[PDB]
Design a protein around this ligand. Structure first.
Ligand SMILES: Cc1cc(NC(=O)NCC[C@](O)(c2ccc(C)o2)C(F)(F)F)no1
Lengths: 179, 177
């Protein structure tokens, strides 16, 4: 019963994470790359500093990772292996995390209310800042879900151990990569 | 209409995720305690004047000293939380939470929040602490710690019973108005 609740939250929050990144790319990023609106000279051709590699993280979760998590829905005790299979992909969170300070300063010092304007216009509850913290949140949450599964799965649970290892290694490597 | 970024910090033992879920759903989640609370916002009227309250969880970042501050910039008010039945979580307010919050956000209001108020008078909780030569954290300990860190308020709540819970978030808002 508990292992099924955890796996359900894992898939449900993954869907919302993919929805949230998608929303971020097609509002905040699109308005900058579109050519529909006047871009403050402070941030022009700097979308790369603002959004870092979030496009590539979204492509991972949207093209691969969510499809593969879905496949483990009836196999929660094995889902650790999903994280092992796709370990290399999570290294992009290291890149993303390194760039977040530079992203935040650039938006502070140089964007004035460009993004605030898009938020009002599109009717979004979440600021660009809310969206850009989410990869940092997500990459430190997988380890919590895996730990919860370890409390309610048998010793057919080295197919969690090694997944948890990966998802402890990625945020630690991200954390250790900061200034 | 005034928007407010409120960030919730403190040890895993405080029940950050549970606190926020129980506040926003108006109920202790009881059946299953979800590990995920995504950034939230809702309109609340305080002292008449309505306000948009934004809530960020930090659960999962407890071991990543350089990732935690990524959430801190442009925060309007912090809840620094400890569990009233974890002396260690209470000491970590002093050792860990207040320093990094001051370092990154020197002029931001702090509310000191004691969670798990419902467990302070619980026989099994009291006993399990007594075996480690400890006791729950009492009210004047909160007050003394609040003063030391420059907390604007010290508040005690339970997610389980909802005692003091709505008040925590009312005061976070009032600390910014
Ligand atoms: C945040 C936060 C959490 C909190 N209070 C609690 O979690 N109290 C309950 C802990 C407990 O496990 C539990 C969960 C559900 C039920 C009935 O009991 C126990 F059995 F001990 F009562 N107050 O603030």
């Amino acid at each position: 019963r508990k292992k099924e609740f955890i796996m359900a939250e894992l898939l449900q929050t993954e869907k919302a994470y993919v929805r949230d990144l998608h929303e971020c790319l097609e509002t905040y990023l699109w308005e900058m790359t579109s050519g529909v609106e006047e871009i403050p000279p402070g941030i022009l051709n700097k979308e790369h500093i603002i959004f870092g590699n979030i496009q590539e993280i979204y492509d991972f979760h949207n093209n691969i990772f969510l499809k593969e998590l879905e496949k483990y829905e009836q196999l929660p005790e094995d889902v650790g292996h999903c994280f092992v299979t796709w370990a290399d992909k999570f290294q992009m969170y290291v890149t993303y995390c390194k760039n977040k300070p530079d992203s935040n300063q650039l938006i502070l010092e140089h964007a004035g209310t460009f993004f605030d304007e898009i938020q009002q216009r599109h009717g979004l509850a979440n600021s660009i800042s809310s969206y850009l913290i989410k990869p940092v949140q997500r990459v430190t949450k997988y380890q919590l879900l895996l730990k919860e599964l370890l409390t309610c799965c048998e010793e057919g649970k080295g197919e969690l151990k090694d997944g948890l290892e990966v998802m402890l290694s990625v945020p630690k490597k991200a954390n250790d990569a900061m200034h | 209409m005034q928007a407010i970024k409120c960030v919730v910090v403190g040890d895993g033992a405080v029940g950050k995720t549970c606190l926020l879920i129980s506040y926003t759903t108006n109920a202790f989640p009881g059946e299953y305690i979800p590990t995920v609370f995504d950034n939230y916002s809702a309109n609340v009227m305080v002292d008449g004047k309505p306000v948009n309250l934004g809530l960020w969880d930090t659960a999962g970042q407890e071991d990543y000293d350089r990732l935690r501050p990524l959430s801190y910039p442009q925060t309007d008010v912090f809840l620094i939380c400890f569990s009233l039945v974890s002396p260690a979580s209470f000491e970590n307010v002093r050792a860990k939470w207040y320093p990094e919050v001051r370092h990154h956000c020197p002029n931001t209001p702090i509310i000191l929040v004691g969670t798990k108020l419902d467990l302070r008078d619980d026989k099994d909780t009291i006993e399990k602490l007594k075996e480690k030569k400890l006791t729950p954290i009492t009210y004047p300990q909160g007050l003394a710690m609040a003063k030391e860190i420059g907390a604007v308020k010290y508040l005690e709540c339970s997610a389980l019973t909802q005692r003091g819970l709505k008040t925590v978030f009312d005061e976070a808002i009032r600390a910014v108005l």
